[PDB]
């Protein structure tokens, strides 16, 4: 698998997007709600790194910065996500 971030579009429903995030001083997905736009997409999982939202860099974002940027996203919400991790041992 490419270790390039991948584009993920979430379509808002008139409630939440369905992700819990942690981190930020990376931004990571902690949980995905099954019955939500994130759950329905099917490709987002705990541990995924959110690197951009709607073209905006979140690599070095604070937690609060990320939260606002995602809350203030339009429709669809476009994420770039890093889903593959390699670890050197």
UniProtKB/Swiss-Prot annotation:
Disulfide bonds: none
Record domain PDZ: where: 7-85
Location(s) in or outside the cell: Cell membrane; Apical cell membrane; Postsynaptic density; Cell projection, Dendrite
Tissue-by-tissue expression: Expressed in heart, brain, placenta, liver, skeletal muscle, kidney and pancreas.
Modified residues (Omega-N-methylarginine): 25
Function: Member of the NMDAR signaling complex that may play a role in control of AMPAR potentiation and synaptic plasticity in excitatory synapses. Promotes clustering of HT2RC at the cell surface.
Disease: Hydrocephalus, congenital, 2, with or without brain or eye anomalies: A form of congenital hydrocephalus, a disease characterized by onset in utero of enlarged ventricles due to accumulation of ventricular cerebrospinal fluid. HYC2 affected individuals have variable neurologic impairment. Some individuals have other brain abnormalities, including lissencephaly, thinning of the corpus callosum, and neuronal heterotopia. Most patients have delayed motor development and some have delayed intellectual development and/or seizures.
Subunit (UniProt): Interacts with CLDN5, DLG4, GRIN1, F11R/JAM, CLDN1, NG2, CRB1, MPP4 and PALS1. Interacts with HTR2A, HTR2B, HTR2C, PLEKHA1/TAPP1, PLEKHA2/TAPP2, CXADR, SYNGAP1, CAMK2A and CAMK2B. Interacts with FAT4 (via cytoplasmic domain). Interacts with DLL1.
Record note on domains: The PDZ domain 1 binds NG2. The PDZ domains 7 and 10 bind the Ad9 E4-ORF1 oncoprotein. The PDZ domain 9 binds F11R. The PDZ domain 10 binds the C-terminus of CLDN1 and KIT and the C-terminal PDZ-binding motif of HTR2C. The PDZ domain 13 binds CXADR. The PDZ domain 2 binds CAMK2A and CAMK2B. The PDZ domains 10 and 13 bind PLEKHA1 and PLEKHA2. The PDZ domain 13 binds SYNGAP1.
This protein's name: Multiple PDZ domain protein
Organism (species): Homo sapiens
Lineage start: Eukaryota, Metazoa, Chordata, Craniata, Vertebrata
């Amino acid at each position: 698998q490419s270790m390039q971030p991948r584009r993920v579009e979430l379509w808002r429903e008139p409630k939440s997007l369905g992700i819990s995030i942690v981190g930020g001083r990376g931004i990571f997905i902690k949980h995905v709600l099954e019955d939500s736009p994130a759950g329905k997409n099917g490709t987002l999982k705990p541990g995924d790194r959110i690197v951009e939202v709607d073209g905006m860099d979140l690599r070095d974002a604070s937690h609060e910065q990320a939260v606002e940027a995602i809350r203030k996203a339009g429709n669809p919400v476009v994420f770039m996500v890093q889903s593959i991790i390699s670890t050197r041992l």
